[model samples]
Target: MVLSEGEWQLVLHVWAKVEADVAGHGQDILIRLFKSHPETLEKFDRFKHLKTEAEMKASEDLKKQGVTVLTALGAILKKKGHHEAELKPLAQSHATKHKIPIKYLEFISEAIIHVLHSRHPGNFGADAQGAMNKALELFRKDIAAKYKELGYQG
Candidate 1:
């Protein structure tokens, strides 16, 4: 299923808020995910050693890697109906190379949604949140399919 026109606009309008400061917002997302699930930090070589929230928040590694993920998602958003095609290689690499877990996607998506709400409270109402969840769900479905393809239990 592709994004409906309203759904597309809902996501993009909020995305513009994030695009203004990808590094900072991306770091915000990673920080949220790390705080929510400390186990996620263990998977990252540089990030794992950051014990304090301040330490993690200040981490350039988190900033850079977070930019990678957020920007990649942005690229997919630009693709409209062909998001799966845009995400396939990213999903495959994450599945085979990085071995990222599906749960992490859920966490990241939640953080992303929260970031938009935090950054632009007026624009991110319940309807906007619903559409945001659906868009992120579409992303997760593709990554989960990729994991299934590789027989990855994680």
Candidate 2:
């Protein structure tokens, strides 16, 4: 899913604003995700034991995972389009090893958008958010294809 150049600019403008604090934003995004979908924490060994928001907040492993999540999103956004090569191993593992339903990834996307709007309310407008949604849809397709290739029925 390729976006028009102008749409890319609009999304990137907001992305640039958040680049300075990717890790923190990642933490916030993940925190939001787990808060909204507590069951998802069960998917991770390190976070499954966390009981409270405070416990989640204090987790070093969660913090590391947050950085990983945000950085992966940045890689795709930086390319301004599909990033199959990078996503292949990730999708493969999610499908074959982790047995993670690809749909779970959508939770992260939702959390990212929520965090962007919540944290950067001034700069990230609806238009930019829409652009990001489109971009994520495209990347998600790429991930789904890879999952299929790896024999993921889901």
Candidate 3:
């Protein structure tokens, strides 16, 4: 599910703006994800007790975790197809060690699209949303394949 050239431009433009405040934007994405999927917090023992966005954002560990995810995402975006090297380890650790379901990894696309649309109201429209969804879907597919190789049933 590769993005069209225009779609890539649209994502890059919006992400350029988002990259300006990686910590804030990253936390916003995570906060939205947690709000929508409270069950996801169960995987993060340190954050499982955090009931509100404010609480999650206030935790130094959560903040660091968000930044770490965003940093990896930034690298993936920067190099595009060269993401497997980075993503493979994450897939291995998350699936094998943490036992995070494949579904939660897939849910990241929706969480990201929600954040992009909410943050850049006028800029992120149907095309942009579709592009991001496709791009994330591709990313998720790769991770899922790796998860399956690790003997994850989900």
lDDT of 2 by residue, 41-102 (tens): 88888678889989978888998998887787788777877576788788877888777775
* Candidate 2: stretches off by over 4 Å: none
Ranking by TM-score: 2, 1, 3
Q: What is the alpha-carbon lDDT for the whole of candidate 1? A: 0.83
Worst 10 residues of 2 by lDDT: 76-85
Question: Model 3, stretches more than 4 Å misplaced?
Answer: none
List residue ranges in candidate 1 displaced over 4 A: none
Candidate 2 colliding pairs, count: 0
TM-score: which candidate is best?
Answer: 2
The per-candidate count of clashes, in order, stands at 0, 0, 0
Question: On a 0 to 1 TM-score scale, where does candidate 2 land against the true structure?
Answer: 0.93
- Candidate lDDT values, in order: 0.83, 0.83, 0.79
lDDT per residue for candidate 1 within 30-131, as digits (tens), equals 898888888888878866899898897888888999999889989887665577677678877777777788988898788888778888898899988888
TM-score winner between 1 and 3, please give it: 1
TM-score of each predicted structure versus truth: 0.92, 0.93, 0.90
